[PDB]
Amino acid sequence: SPGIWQLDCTHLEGKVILVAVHVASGYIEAEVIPAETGQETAYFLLKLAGRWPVKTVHTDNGSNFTSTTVKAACWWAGIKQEDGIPYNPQSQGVIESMNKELKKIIGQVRDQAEHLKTAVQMAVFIHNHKRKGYSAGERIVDIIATDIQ
Amino acid sequence: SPGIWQLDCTHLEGKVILVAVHVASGYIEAEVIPAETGQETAYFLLKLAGRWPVKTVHTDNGSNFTSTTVKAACWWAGIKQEDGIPYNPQSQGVIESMNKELKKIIGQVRDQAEHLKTAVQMAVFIHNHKRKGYSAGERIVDIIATDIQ
Ligand SMILES: O=C1C(=O)N(Cc2ccc3c(c2C(=O)O)OCCO3)c2ccc(Br)cc21
Ligand SMILES: O=C1C(=O)N(Cc2ccc3c(c2C(=O)O)OCCO3)c2ccc(Br)cc21
Ligand SMILES: O=C1C(=O)N(Cc2ccc3c(c2C(=O)O)OCCO3)c2ccc(Br)cc21
Ligand SMILES: O=C1C(=O)N(Cc2ccc3c(c2C(=O)O)OCCO3)c2ccc(Br)cc21
Protein backbone atom coordinates (compact mmCIF):
# COMPACT_ATOMS: atom_id res chain seq x y z
CA SER A 1 0.00 0.00 0.00
CA PRO A 2 2.79 2.64 0.47
CA GLY A 3 3.68 2.18 -3.26
CA ILE A 4 0.12 2.35 -4.69
CA TRP A 5 -1.16 5.26 -6.77
CA GLN A 6 -4.32 5.85 -8.82
CA LEU A 7 -4.49 7.91 -12.01
CA ASP A 8 -7.47 10.19 -12.56
CA CYS A 9 -8.29 12.41 -15.49
CA THR A 10 -10.76 15.34 -15.24
CA HIS A 11 -11.75 18.22 -17.60
CA LEU A 12 -11.88 21.98 -17.11
CA GLU A 13 -11.84 24.99 -19.48
CA GLY A 14 -11.60 22.66 -22.50
CA LYS A 15 -8.35 21.17 -21.14
CA VAL A 16 -7.50 18.03 -19.25
CA ILE A 17 -6.12 17.78 -15.72
CA LEU A 18 -4.22 14.60 -15.11
CA VAL A 19 -3.96 13.64 -11.43
CA ALA A 20 -2.01 10.87 -9.62
CA VAL A 21 -3.34 10.08 -6.10
CA HIS A 22 -1.34 8.30 -3.43
CA VAL A 23 -4.14 6.04 -2.29
CA ALA A 24 -3.17 5.65 1.41
CA SER A 25 -2.52 9.36 2.11
CA GLY A 26 -4.69 11.26 -0.31
CA TYR A 27 -1.55 13.17 -1.48
CA ILE A 28 -1.70 14.22 -5.13
CA GLU A 29 0.41 15.46 -8.06
CA ALA A 30 -1.27 16.97 -11.13
CA GLU A 31 -0.62 18.55 -14.50
CA VAL A 32 -2.59 20.34 -17.22
CA ILE A 33 -2.37 18.80 -20.72
CA PRO A 34 -4.20 19.59 -24.00
CA ALA A 35 -5.55 16.02 -24.17
CA GLU A 36 -4.99 12.69 -22.48
CA THR A 37 -2.79 10.66 -24.81
CA GLY A 38 -0.56 7.65 -24.04
CA GLN A 39 2.54 9.82 -24.56
CA GLU A 40 1.44 12.46 -22.05
CA THR A 41 0.34 9.82 -19.54
CA ALA A 42 3.65 7.95 -19.94
CA TYR A 43 5.66 11.14 -19.35
CA PHE A 44 3.56 12.07 -16.29
CA LEU A 45 4.22 8.59 -14.79
CA LEU A 46 7.97 8.84 -15.42
CA LYS A 47 7.98 12.20 -13.55
CA LEU A 48 5.99 10.78 -10.67
CA ALA A 49 8.11 7.61 -10.28
CA GLY A 50 11.32 9.71 -10.27
CA ARG A 51 9.90 11.67 -7.28
CA TRP A 52 8.15 8.95 -5.15
CA PRO A 53 8.61 5.14 -4.89
CA VAL A 54 5.77 4.15 -7.27
CA LYS A 55 5.27 0.36 -7.16
CA THR A 56 1.82 0.01 -8.64
CA VAL A 57 -0.38 2.35 -10.69
CA HIS A 58 -4.11 1.83 -11.12
CA THR A 59 -4.63 3.34 -14.56
CA ASP A 60 -7.63 5.61 -15.13
CA ASN A 61 -9.06 3.96 -18.30
CA GLY A 62 -8.47 1.18 -20.82
CA SER A 63 -6.74 3.31 -23.44
CA ASN A 64 -3.92 4.12 -21.00
CA PHE A 65 -3.96 0.56 -19.72
CA THR A 66 -3.46 -0.56 -23.35
CA SER A 67 -1.15 2.18 -24.57
CA THR A 68 2.24 0.84 -25.65
CA THR A 69 3.99 4.06 -24.60
CA VAL A 70 2.40 3.79 -21.12
CA LYS A 71 3.48 0.20 -20.88
CA ALA A 72 7.03 1.18 -22.01
CA ALA A 73 7.22 3.84 -19.30
CA CYS A 74 5.91 1.50 -16.59
CA TRP A 75 8.52 -1.10 -17.60
CA TRP A 76 11.29 1.59 -17.66
CA ALA A 77 10.34 2.94 -14.21
CA GLY A 78 9.70 -0.40 -12.54
CA ILE A 79 5.99 0.20 -12.15
CA LYS A 80 3.29 -2.55 -12.12
CA GLN A 81 0.46 -1.28 -14.23
CA GLU A 82 -2.95 -2.45 -13.01
CA ASP A 83 -6.58 -1.67 -14.04
CA GLY A 84 -8.43 0.95 -12.01
CA ILE A 85 -11.67 -1.03 -11.88
CA PRO A 86 -13.49 -0.03 -8.66
CA TYR A 87 -13.81 -3.60 -7.24
CA ASN A 88 -14.68 -1.76 -4.03
CA PRO A 89 -17.53 0.43 -5.51
CA GLN A 90 -16.78 3.35 -3.09
CA SER A 91 -13.98 4.06 -5.63
CA GLN A 92 -16.04 5.75 -8.39
CA GLY A 93 -17.34 8.06 -5.62
CA VAL A 94 -14.05 8.83 -3.83
CA ILE A 95 -12.54 9.92 -7.21
CA GLU A 96 -15.69 11.91 -8.21
CA SER A 97 -15.54 13.67 -4.79
CA MET A 98 -11.82 14.39 -5.33
CA ASN A 99 -12.46 15.86 -8.76
CA LYS A 100 -15.24 18.02 -7.30
CA GLU A 101 -12.99 19.21 -4.45
CA LEU A 102 -10.06 20.01 -6.80
CA LYS A 103 -12.22 22.04 -9.13
CA LYS A 104 -13.69 23.91 -6.15
CA ILE A 105 -10.16 24.76 -5.04
CA ILE A 106 -9.21 25.79 -8.52
CA GLY A 107 -12.23 28.12 -8.55
CA GLN A 108 -11.16 29.67 -5.24
CA VAL A 109 -7.72 30.58 -6.60
CA ARG A 110 -8.63 30.93 -10.29
CA ASP A 111 -8.51 34.74 -10.32
CA GLN A 112 -4.99 34.96 -8.81
CA ALA A 113 -3.37 33.49 -11.96
CA GLU A 114 -3.81 33.87 -15.66
CA HIS A 115 -2.97 30.29 -16.75
CA LEU A 116 -5.02 27.34 -15.67
CA LYS A 117 -1.79 25.35 -15.06
CA THR A 118 -0.78 27.84 -12.34
CA ALA A 119 -4.16 27.58 -10.62
CA VAL A 120 -3.95 23.79 -10.76
CA GLN A 121 -0.57 23.83 -9.03
CA MET A 122 -1.94 26.22 -6.36
CA ALA A 123 -4.75 23.71 -5.83
CA VAL A 124 -2.24 20.86 -5.52
CA PHE A 125 -0.44 22.96 -2.96
CA ILE A 126 -3.65 23.73 -0.94
CA HIS A 127 -4.88 20.09 -1.08
CA ASN A 128 -1.59 18.56 0.04
CA HIS A 129 -1.09 21.06 2.90
CA LYS A 130 -4.74 20.97 4.24
CA ARG A 131 -5.05 19.78 7.79
CA LYS A 132 -7.64 16.99 8.14
CA GLY A 133 -4.68 16.44 12.61
CA TYR A 134 -2.26 15.53 9.76
CA SER A 135 -2.03 16.80 6.10
CA ALA A 136 -1.81 14.50 3.05
CA GLY A 137 1.85 15.62 2.61
CA GLU A 138 2.60 14.59 6.17
CA ARG A 139 0.79 11.27 5.76
CA ILE A 140 2.60 10.22 2.60
CA VAL A 141 6.02 10.97 4.09
CA ASP A 142 5.15 9.03 7.38
CA ILE A 143 3.73 6.11 5.39
CA ILE A 144 6.80 5.75 3.15
CA ALA A 145 9.23 6.36 6.04
CA THR A 146 7.58 3.67 8.20
CA ASP A 147 7.87 1.46 5.15
CA ILE A 148 11.62 2.17 4.85
CA GLN A 149 12.27 1.15 8.57
CA SER B 1 17.61 21.95 7.34
CA PRO B 2 14.81 19.47 6.32
CA GLY B 3 13.07 22.45 4.58
CA ILE B 4 16.11 23.82 2.69
CA TRP B 5 16.46 23.62 -1.08
CA GLN B 6 18.97 25.06 -3.60
CA LEU B 7 18.03 26.08 -7.15
CA ASP B 8 20.56 25.38 -9.91
CA CYS B 9 20.32 26.20 -13.62
CA THR B 10 22.44 24.39 -16.27
CA HIS B 11 22.48 24.36 -20.10
CA LEU B 12 22.27 21.54 -22.66
CA GLU B 13 21.25 21.28 -26.32
CA GLY B 14 20.54 25.03 -26.33
CA LYS B 15 17.91 24.65 -23.59
CA VAL B 16 17.92 25.22 -19.88
CA ILE B 17 17.57 22.56 -17.20
CA LEU B 18 16.25 23.99 -13.94
CA VAL B 19 17.08 21.92 -10.88
CA ALA B 20 15.95 22.11 -7.20
CA VAL B 21 18.21 20.10 -4.80
CA HIS B 22 17.13 19.17 -1.29
CA VAL B 23 20.40 20.11 0.37
CA ALA B 24 20.43 17.54 3.23
CA SER B 25 19.60 14.51 1.03
CA GLY B 26 20.81 15.26 -2.50
CA TYR B 27 17.30 14.49 -3.83
CA ILE B 28 16.37 16.55 -6.87
CA GLU B 29 13.44 17.69 -9.06
CA ALA B 30 14.20 19.16 -12.52
CA GLU B 31 12.50 20.54 -15.63
CA VAL B 32 13.54 21.62 -19.14
CA ILE B 33 12.56 25.20 -20.11
CA PRO B 34 13.44 27.33 -23.17
CA ALA B 35 15.09 29.97 -20.93
CA GLU B 36 15.40 30.88 -17.23
CA THR B 37 12.87 33.68 -16.70
CA GLY B 38 11.30 34.78 -13.38
CA GLN B 39 7.97 33.38 -14.57
CA GLU B 40 9.34 29.92 -15.25
CA THR B 41 11.32 29.94 -11.99
CA ALA B 42 8.23 31.07 -10.03
CA TYR B 43 6.08 28.30 -11.57
CA PHE B 44 8.79 25.71 -10.87
CA LEU B 45 8.92 26.78 -7.17
CA LEU B 46 5.15 26.62 -6.84
CA LYS B 47 5.19 23.01 -8.13
CA LEU B 48 8.02 22.03 -5.83
CA ALA B 49 6.44 23.61 -2.70
CA GLY B 50 3.11 21.81 -3.42
CA ARG B 51 4.94 18.47 -3.37
CA TRP B 52 7.50 18.91 -0.51
CA PRO B 53 7.56 21.17 2.62
CA VAL B 54 9.86 23.86 1.17
CA LYS B 55 10.79 26.35 3.91
CA THR B 56 13.82 28.09 2.39
CA VAL B 57 15.21 28.26 -1.09
CA HIS B 58 18.66 29.49 -1.99
CA THR B 59 18.09 31.06 -5.39
CA ASP B 60 20.55 30.33 -8.17
CA ASN B 61 21.35 33.94 -9.25
CA GLY B 62 20.45 37.56 -8.60
CA SER B 63 17.94 37.90 -11.37
CA ASN B 64 15.71 35.24 -9.74
CA PHE B 65 16.51 36.66 -6.32
CA THR B 66 15.20 40.05 -7.61
CA SER B 67 12.34 38.86 -9.82
CA THR B 68 9.00 40.19 -8.61
CA THR B 69 7.26 37.09 -9.95
CA VAL B 70 9.65 34.84 -8.02
CA LYS B 71 9.10 36.88 -4.90
CA ALA B 72 5.27 36.70 -5.42
CA ALA B 73 5.48 32.91 -5.65
CA CYS B 74 7.68 32.55 -2.61
CA TRP B 75 5.20 34.72 -0.69
CA TRP B 76 2.21 32.66 -1.98
CA ALA B 77 3.86 29.34 -1.11
CA GLY B 78 5.24 30.36 2.27
CA ILE B 79 8.85 30.06 1.16
CA LYS B 80 11.75 32.18 2.56
CA GLN B 81 13.77 33.32 -0.42
CA GLU B 82 17.52 33.55 0.32
CA ASP B 83 20.63 34.18 -1.79
CA GLY B 84 22.64 31.20 -2.90
CA ILE B 85 26.09 32.72 -2.34
CA PRO B 86 28.53 29.87 -1.46
CA TYR B 87 29.77 31.19 1.93
CA ASN B 88 30.89 27.60 2.39
CA PRO B 89 33.10 27.63 -0.79
CA GLN B 90 32.69 23.82 -1.36
CA SER B 91 29.20 24.81 -2.65
CA GLN B 92 30.35 26.19 -6.03
CA GLY B 93 32.12 22.84 -6.56
CA VAL B 94 29.32 20.60 -5.21
CA ILE B 95 26.83 22.23 -7.65
CA GLU B 96 29.33 21.98 -10.58
CA SER B 97 29.83 18.28 -9.66
CA MET B 98 26.04 17.76 -9.65
CA ASN B 99 25.62 19.37 -13.05
CA LYS B 100 28.41 17.25 -14.46
CA GLU B 101 26.85 14.04 -13.05
CA LEU B 102 23.36 14.94 -14.39
CA LYS B 103 24.66 15.60 -17.83
CA LYS B 104 26.52 12.28 -17.71
CA ILE B 105 23.29 10.48 -16.76
CA ILE B 106 21.46 12.28 -19.45
CA GLY B 107 24.11 11.22 -21.99
CA GLN B 108 23.67 7.61 -20.77
CA VAL B 109 19.92 7.60 -21.45
CA ARG B 110 19.88 10.27 -24.20
CA ASP B 111 19.27 7.74 -27.01
CA GLN B 112 16.27 6.01 -25.36
CA ALA B 113 14.05 9.13 -25.78
CA GLU B 114 13.44 11.62 -28.52
CA HIS B 115 12.84 14.74 -26.34
CA LEU B 116 15.39 16.19 -23.99
CA LYS B 117 12.70 16.63 -21.32
CA THR B 118 12.15 12.86 -21.26
CA ALA B 119 15.84 12.13 -20.83
CA VAL B 120 16.02 14.72 -18.05
CA GLN B 121 13.22 12.97 -16.17
CA MET B 122 14.94 9.58 -16.63
CA ALA B 123 18.04 11.13 -15.15
CA VAL B 124 16.05 12.52 -12.19
CA PHE B 125 14.73 9.03 -11.68
CA ILE B 126 18.21 7.36 -11.84
CA HIS B 127 19.75 10.02 -9.54
CA ASN B 128 17.09 9.82 -6.87
CA HIS B 129 17.04 5.98 -6.84
CA LYS B 130 20.88 5.41 -6.85
CA ARG B 131 22.12 3.80 -3.65
CA LYS B 132 25.37 5.38 -2.40
CA GLY B 133 23.40 2.11 1.27
CA TYR B 134 20.46 4.63 1.20
CA SER B 135 19.24 6.55 -1.93
CA ALA B 136 18.49 10.29 -2.05
CA GLY B 137 14.75 9.52 -2.23
CA GLU B 138 15.08 7.43 0.93
CA ARG B 139 17.08 10.10 2.73
CA ILE B 140 14.68 12.89 1.98
CA VAL B 141 11.64 10.91 3.21
CA ASP B 142 13.55 9.86 6.49
CA ILE B 143 14.75 13.43 7.07
CA ILE B 144 11.30 14.96 6.69
CA ALA B 145 9.58 12.16 8.67
CA THR B 146 12.05 12.57 11.54
CA ASP B 147 11.22 16.25 11.41
CA ILE B 148 7.44 15.54 11.52
CA GLN B 149 7.96 13.62 14.86
O1 LIG C 1 -11.64 14.93 -1.11
C1 LIG C 1 -10.71 14.29 -1.59
C2 LIG C 1 -10.48 12.81 -1.59
O2 LIG C 1 -11.40 12.02 -1.44
N1 LIG C 1 -9.11 12.65 -1.86
C3 LIG C 1 -8.64 11.36 -2.32
C4 LIG C 1 -8.25 10.48 -1.19
C5 LIG C 1 -8.05 9.14 -1.46
C6 LIG C 1 -7.70 8.28 -0.43
C7 LIG C 1 -7.54 8.77 0.86
C8 LIG C 1 -7.72 10.11 1.14
C9 LIG C 1 -8.08 10.96 0.11
C10 LIG C 1 -8.27 12.37 0.51
O3 LIG C 1 -9.15 12.54 1.41
O4 LIG C 1 -7.59 13.27 -0.03
O5 LIG C 1 -7.56 10.68 2.43
C11 LIG C 1 -7.14 9.75 3.42
C12 LIG C 1 -6.33 8.67 2.76
O6 LIG C 1 -7.17 7.92 1.90
C13 LIG C 1 -8.66 13.84 -2.50
C14 LIG C 1 -7.51 14.11 -3.20
C15 LIG C 1 -7.40 15.40 -3.73
C16 LIG C 1 -8.38 16.37 -3.55
BR1 LIG C 1 -8.26 18.13 -4.25
C17 LIG C 1 -9.52 16.09 -2.84
C18 LIG C 1 -9.60 14.82 -2.34
O1 LIG D 1 -0.60 34.16 -9.98
C1 LIG D 1 0.48 33.84 -10.47
C2 LIG D 1 0.84 34.27 -11.78
O2 LIG D 1 0.08 35.14 -12.25
N1 LIG D 1 1.99 33.46 -12.09
C3 LIG D 1 3.00 33.97 -12.88
C4 LIG D 1 2.51 34.56 -14.13
C5 LIG D 1 3.15 35.77 -14.36
C6 LIG D 1 2.88 36.50 -15.48
C7 LIG D 1 1.96 35.99 -16.36
C8 LIG D 1 1.31 34.78 -16.14
C9 LIG D 1 1.56 34.02 -15.01
C10 LIG D 1 0.81 32.71 -14.82
O3 LIG D 1 -0.41 32.67 -14.52
O4 LIG D 1 1.45 31.66 -15.00
O5 LIG D 1 0.38 34.30 -17.07
C11 LIG D 1 0.79 34.79 -18.34
C12 LIG D 1 0.64 36.27 -18.22
O6 LIG D 1 1.75 36.78 -17.48
C13 LIG D 1 2.46 32.69 -11.00
C14 LIG D 1 3.55 31.84 -10.75
C15 LIG D 1 3.62 31.28 -9.45
C16 LIG D 1 2.61 31.61 -8.52
BR1 LIG D 1 2.24 31.11 -6.73
C17 LIG D 1 1.57 32.43 -8.79
C18 LIG D 1 1.54 32.95 -10.02
O1 LIG E 1 26.88 14.46 -7.36
C1 LIG E 1 25.90 15.03 -6.93
C2 LIG E 1 25.81 15.89 -5.72
O2 LIG E 1 26.82 16.40 -5.27
N1 LIG E 1 24.45 15.99 -5.44
C3 LIG E 1 23.94 17.11 -4.72
C4 LIG E 1 24.03 16.90 -3.26
C5 LIG E 1 24.00 17.96 -2.39
C6 LIG E 1 24.11 17.71 -1.04
C7 LIG E 1 24.24 16.42 -0.58
C8 LIG E 1 24.25 15.37 -1.45
C9 LIG E 1 24.15 15.63 -2.78
C10 LIG E 1 24.18 14.51 -3.70
O3 LIG E 1 25.20 13.81 -3.68
O4 LIG E 1 23.19 14.35 -4.43
O5 LIG E 1 24.38 14.05 -1.08
C11 LIG E 1 24.16 13.88 0.29
C12 LIG E 1 23.49 15.08 0.87
O6 LIG E 1 24.35 16.18 0.75
C13 LIG E 1 23.76 15.63 -6.61
C14 LIG E 1 22.45 15.78 -6.95
C15 LIG E 1 22.06 15.32 -8.20
C16 LIG E 1 22.94 14.75 -9.09
BR1 LIG E 1 22.44 14.11 -10.80
C17 LIG E 1 24.26 14.61 -8.74
C18 LIG E 1 24.60 15.06 -7.50
O1 LIG F 1 11.85 6.85 -24.37
C1 LIG F 1 10.76 7.36 -24.17
C2 LIG F 1 10.06 8.05 -25.23
O2 LIG F 1 10.58 7.93 -26.35
N1 LIG F 1 8.97 8.65 -24.53
C3 LIG F 1 7.74 8.78 -25.13
C4 LIG F 1 7.78 9.37 -26.48
C5 LIG F 1 6.97 8.66 -27.35
C6 LIG F 1 6.84 9.05 -28.66
C7 LIG F 1 7.52 10.17 -29.06
C8 LIG F 1 8.32 10.89 -28.18
C9 LIG F 1 8.49 10.51 -26.86
C10 LIG F 1 9.38 11.34 -25.95
O3 LIG F 1 10.64 11.33 -26.02
O4 LIG F 1 8.80 12.07 -25.16
O5 LIG F 1 8.99 12.02 -28.62
C11 LIG F 1 8.17 12.57 -29.64
C12 LIG F 1 8.21 11.57 -30.75
O6 LIG F 1 7.32 10.51 -30.39
C13 LIG F 1 8.85 8.28 -23.16
C14 LIG F 1 7.95 8.54 -22.12
C15 LIG F 1 8.24 7.93 -20.87
C16 LIG F 1 9.40 7.13 -20.79
BR1 LIG F 1 10.26 6.15 -19.42
C17 LIG F 1 10.27 6.90 -21.81
C18 LIG F 1 9.94 7.49 -22.98
Side-chain angles (χ1 to χ4, degrees):
Chain A
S1 126
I4 304 176
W5 291 72
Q6 166 80 228
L7 282 178
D8 158 51
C9 185
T10 195
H11 294 73
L12 198 65
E13 300 178 19
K15 293 187 182 73
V16 165
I17 300 172
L18 184 57
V19 182
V21 180
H22 184 251
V23 167
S25 58
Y27 171 92
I28 63 167
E29 299 225 2
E31 64 172 25
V32 173
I33 49 177
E36 192 182 30
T37 62
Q39 289 182 38
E40 291 292 348
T41 301
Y43 179 73
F44 180 70
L45 295 173
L46 171 58
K47 291 191 289 176
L48 179 68
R51 295 160 175 66
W52 291 100
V54 176
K55 181 215 192 169
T56 299
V57 164
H58 292 298
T59 54
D60 51 327
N61 62 50
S63 296
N64 276 336
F65 187 59
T66 302
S67 163
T68 58
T69 310
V70 176
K71 292 187 183 300
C74 285
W75 162 77
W76 195 96
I79 290 172
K80 289 182 202 133
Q81 187 214 209
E82 293 180 357
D83 65 74
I85 303 152
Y87 301 121
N88 189 327
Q90 242 168 233
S91 287
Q92 302 110 99
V94 150
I95 292 160
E96 143 225 84
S97 269
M98 174 179 80
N99 291 336
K100 175 159 194 162
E101 189 52 41
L102 261 183
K103 283 170 192 200
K104 185 174 92 146
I105 304 171
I106 289 155
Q108 303 165 357
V109 303
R110 187 65 184 90
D111 80 314
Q112 293 173 49
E114 207 228 282
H115 295 137
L116 176 62
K117 57 178 204 183
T118 301
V120 165
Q121 301 307 322
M122 289 177 168
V124 169
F125 180 110
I126 288 167
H127 170 73
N128 289 337
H129 290 256
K130 180 158 181 221
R131 211 71 70 165
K132 291 281 312 232
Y134 279 115
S135 64
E138 289 182 314
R139 289 193 297 266
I140 183 173
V141 163
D142 279 339
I143 290 152
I144 291 155
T146 297
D147 201 62
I148 289 149
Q149 315 319 315
Chain B
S1 102
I4 304 177
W5 290 76
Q6 169 77 234
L7 283 177
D8 156 50
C9 180
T10 188
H11 294 75
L12 196 69
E13 301 178 18
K15 296 185 184 58
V16 168
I17 301 175
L18 183 54
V19 173
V21 184
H22 182 251
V23 168
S25 66
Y27 170 91
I28 64 166
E29 296 227 4
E31 68 173 19
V32 175
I33 51 178
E36 185 188 53
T37 61
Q39 289 185 216
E40 294 291 352
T41 300
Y43 179 71
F44 178 72
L45 293 173
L46 170 62
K47 292 189 287 173
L48 179 68
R51 293 160 174 67
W52 292 102
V54 174
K55 180 221 202 177
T56 304
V57 63
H58 291 282
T59 50
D60 52 326
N61 59 50
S63 295
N64 278 335
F65 186 59
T66 303
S67 163
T68 51
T69 302
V70 169
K71 290 185 185 300
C74 286
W75 165 79
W76 195 98
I79 290 175
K80 181 191 178 70
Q81 191 196 190
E82 290 181 2
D83 62 72
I85 304 150
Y87 298 111
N88 180 291
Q90 250 161 23
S91 300
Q92 285 154 128
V94 160
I95 288 164
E96 276 161 39
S97 258
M98 178 176 73
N99 292 341
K100 185 184 96 189
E101 196 48 50
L102 261 170
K103 280 173 194 196
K104 186 191 174 190
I105 303 169
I106 291 163
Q108 297 169 2
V109 305
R110 187 61 189 87
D111 83 320
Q112 289 170 54
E114 208 225 91
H115 290 126
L116 178 64
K117 58 197 267 204
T118 304
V120 166
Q121 303 305 323
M122 286 176 172
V124 170
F125 181 110
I126 288 167
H127 170 74
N128 290 334
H129 285 78
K130 194 184 170 234
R131 321 184 143 283
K132 292 191 66 202
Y134 295 116
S135 63
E138 294 177 316
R139 293 195 292 271
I140 182 176
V141 163
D142 285 338
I143 291 156
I144 293 152
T146 296
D147 198 57
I148 286 151
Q149 263 72 206

